[PDB]
Amino acid sequence: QWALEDFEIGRPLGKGKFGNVYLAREKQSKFILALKVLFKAQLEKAGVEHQLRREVEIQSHLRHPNILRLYGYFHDATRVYLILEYAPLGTVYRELQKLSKFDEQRTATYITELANALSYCHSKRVIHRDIKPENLLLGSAGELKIADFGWSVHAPSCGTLDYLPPEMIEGRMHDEKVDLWSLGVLCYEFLVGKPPFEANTYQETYKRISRVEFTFPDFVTEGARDLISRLLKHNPSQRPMLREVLEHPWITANSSK
Ligand SMILES: Nc1nc(Nc2ccc(S(N)(=O)=O)cc2)nn1C(=O)c1c(F)cccc1F
Ligand SMILES: O=C(O)c1cc(-c2cccc(Br)c2)nc2c(F)cccc12
């Protein structure tokens, strides 16, 4: 079905970890795509083979304009290859380093696209549990696309803690409401330029998250402060639904259609 000899490899798009993502073209069709090349050696050592097979399983079945498509896969003597959709405008992470922060218009648009992709995800019981600017790509029309379903499982079932909710950092039972916390973290970071629980240590970030310790800078408007505060609740049941988020007055007044 799939072999390396079917693709013309180009420029690197990102580096790992388990390996790199390269720009590639399918010889037979001239289809431009992105080839994630993971090394079997590193994947063992970490014991992620079950998780990756789980990711690929989930990601290949999903169909949404705000979820990055996985077209297929293959493997050789030492590497596993993922055939991904190529997002031409790069990462939201890189965009945020460039602009430092985003306006209300851009933030509400990204939050709408993210909530939509998450509603679709939850309607198939899939919980992402890893939404972060490094895992968000931008399509040719600048539309947001969720990219890494590595740490995703079926609800209700590590690096920097910045986007994880209290129930997850404490090891407790967590469900769909975990992704609603991530949304609040992202909405804050888009407007401020840094996540609300950021710190110089993991130990301190853990304290900040468990205690829900965030302050808004002066430029954060009332509407943004209301949506973020509602999302950043310790009790998961106290967080709103995705329907409520899409219908928030700050979202409806700044988003797009
Ligand atoms: N599948 C995919 N498409 C893109 N598009 C893209 C376009 C330009 C750039 S840039 N400005 O040169 O760094 C980067 C990516 N990335 N991508 C990935 O899997 C990917 C990812 F999710 C995270 C990090 C790196 C990646 F490579
Ligand atoms: O035994 C292998 O060759 C092997 C295969 C895969 C793999 C195959 C299809 C889809 C996906 Br996702 C992964 N992964 C491996 C791995 F992660 C480590 C060692 C061997 C394999």
Side-chain angles (χ1 to χ4, degrees):
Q1 170 75 87
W2 286 128
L4 197 54
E5 48 170 67
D6 295 305
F7 308 102
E8 255 154 322
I9 319 299
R11 181 180 60 103
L13 299 173
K15 287 164 248 169
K17 265 158 277 188
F18 312 120
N20 307 354
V21 182
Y22 297 105
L23 186 65
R25 192 183 57 167
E26 206 279 295
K27 300 173 180 170
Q28 286 192 33
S29 58
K30 295 175 304 190
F31 198 89
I32 289 272
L33 49 97
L35 244 181
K36 191 189 286 173
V37 182
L38 313 107
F39 255 82
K40 287 170 177 193
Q42 282 90 85
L43 294 159
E44 246 152 357
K45 294 192 273 178
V48 277
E49 180 166 359
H50 187 93
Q51 214 194 29
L52 174 75
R53 286 191 118 108
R54 220 223 288 118
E55 161 187 356
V56 177
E57 164 214 280
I58 297 161
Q59 226 185 317
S60 60
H61 289 80
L62 319 174
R63 303 293 141 97
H64 193 278
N66 305 124
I67 289 145
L68 192 77
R69 281 288 328 275
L70 194 143
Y71 300 113
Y73 59 89
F74 62 111
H75 65 111
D76 88 300
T78 177
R79 300 152 295 253
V80 176
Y81 300 93
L82 300 205
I83 308 157
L84 309 165
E85 170 191 344
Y86 155 70
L89 295 195
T91 72
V92 170
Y93 177 86
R94 195 204 173 87
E95 261 288 298
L96 198 50
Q97 288 193 322
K98 280 172 68 270
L99 302 163
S100 289
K101 51 191 166 76
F102 304 152
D103 52 58
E104 306 209 294
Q105 162 117 67
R106 188 194 284 254
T107 298
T109 313
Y110 287 165
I111 299 305
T112 298
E113 302 178 308
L114 223 23
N116 283 331
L118 290 170
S119 275
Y120 169 83
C121 277
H122 299 155
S123 82
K124 309 206 100 155
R125 282 297 293 199
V126 172
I127 57 165
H128 197 274
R129 325 177 307 154
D130 197 40
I131 310 284
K132 59 168 111 163
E134 304 95 273
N135 298 349
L136 307 177
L137 291 163
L138 296 160
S140 62
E143 71 281 19
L144 198 155
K145 277 158 191 290
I146 313 182
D148 286 313
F149 279 83
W151 292 74
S152 74
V153 212
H154 287 84
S157 296
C158 81
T160 267
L161 298 165
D162 273 319
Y163 311 82
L164 299 169
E167 75 257 44
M168 265 199 78
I169 68 154
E170 286 157 24
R172 300 185 275 145
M173 332 116 68
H174 66 249
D175 50 351
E176 276 107 320
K177 292 290 202 196
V178 148
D179 292 334
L180 277 130
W181 170 278
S182 282
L183 251 202
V185 176
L186 268 94
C187 188
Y188 186 101
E189 183 176 11
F190 289 165
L191 294 164
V192 180
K194 72 186 107 174
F197 311 108
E198 217 187 53
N200 273 315
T201 86
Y202 176 107
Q203 285 84 16
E204 183 214 326
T205 302
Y206 188 104
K207 276 190 138 72
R208 294 276 304 267
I209 295 154
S210 46
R211 292 162 180 188
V212 202
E213 273 167 36
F214 65 90
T215 53
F216 296 110
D218 311 279
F219 53 83
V220 189
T221 75
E222 294 154 353
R225 289 183 189 224
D226 176 54
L227 178 69
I228 297 158
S229 288
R230 278 197 224 269
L231 290 160
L232 297 188
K233 295 275 191 182
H234 202 270
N235 190 240
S237 27
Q238 288 199 327
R239 286 161 205 162
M241 297 180 295
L242 292 164
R243 308 176 180 180
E244 294 175 63
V245 173
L246 292 154
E247 295 149 41
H248 190 275
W250 184 83
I251 290 302
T252 62
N254 293 282
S255 173
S256 318
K257 269 257 266 188

